[PDB]
């Protein structure tokens, strides 16, 4: 059932991801240094990481079969509304359940709740982000499922402001059926048990997390002294 047009999509998406995700984390030395121990000590370093991550999510999104065919206005809308969510998803690769932190090579670049808290987010709103990473990590997705899930997330037709929703849906279905078919044919039991449905559930949880992120970014950015510490891409993508 794994049609050939589908194994191609997969190869495209894997190569895309390989070209936009360096598991060595070499580029992180360019970011403004991390500061642990005052207020918003971690903001400059994490603002840099996010902005970098947004760049990388854009390069990923551009290779999504079909994405090209959309209007530039639709591409922008899709990316603006998914960036944070794809960032949350792609972060799962560095997140570890051993101590509920994002381990990016070295202790300089190993981020936990306290660090995130020093980027202007209370420990309370950060917890659901952790619970999300935990439940996603437990799915133990294949790298193929991972990239499909990020692409499906980007091409969502219900994002506010979408013009050609019909075409977004057409592109997303192509990717959904690819994933559904991939799991049945390639993912053995019991890990495959309802694995699709659970993958789609994470897309629902991400909408919730997105909303919460927007609300919190609205409060943070409204303080011009904080917004000053962001990047121009973050201001443009997440808003000003």
């Amino acid at each position: 059932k794994l049609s050939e047009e589908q194994q191609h999509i997969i190869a495209i998406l894997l190569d895309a991801h390989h070209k936009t995700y360096d598991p060595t984390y070499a580029d992180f030395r360019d970011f403004r240094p991390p500061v642990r121990m005052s207020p918003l000590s971690m903001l400059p370093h994490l603002a840099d990481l996010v902005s970098y991550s947004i760049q990388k999510v854009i390069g990923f999104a551009k290779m999504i079969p079909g994405f090209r065919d959309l209007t530039s206005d639709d591409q922008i809308v899709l990316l603006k509304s998914s960036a944070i969510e794809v960032i949350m998803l792609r972060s799962n690769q560095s997140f570890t359940m051993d101590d509920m932190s994002w381990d990016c090579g070295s202790q300089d670049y190993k981020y936990d709740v306290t660090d995130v808290s020093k980027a202007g987010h209370t420990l309370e709103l950060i917890e659901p982000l952790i619970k999300f990473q935990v439940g996603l990590k437990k799915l133990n997705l294949h790298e193929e499922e991972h990239v499909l899930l990020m692409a499906i997330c980007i091409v969502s037709p219900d994002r506010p402001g979408v013009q050609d929703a019909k075409l977004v849906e057409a592109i997303q279905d192509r990717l959904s059926n690819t994933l559904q078919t991939y799991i049945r044919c390639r993912h053995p039991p019991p890990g495959s048990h309802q694995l699709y449905a659970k993958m789609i559930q994470k897309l629902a949880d991400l909408r919730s997390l997105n909303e919460e992120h927007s609300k919190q970014y609205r409060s943070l950015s409204f303080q011009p002294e904080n917004s000053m510490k962001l990047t121009p891409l973050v201001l443009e993508v997440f808003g000003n």
Partner: peptide, 11 residues
């Protein structure tokens, strides 16, 4: 908006 940075990273 008019986001020129995004549009440029998009192509």
């Amino acid at each position: 908006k008019n986001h020129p940075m995004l549009m440029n990273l998009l192509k």
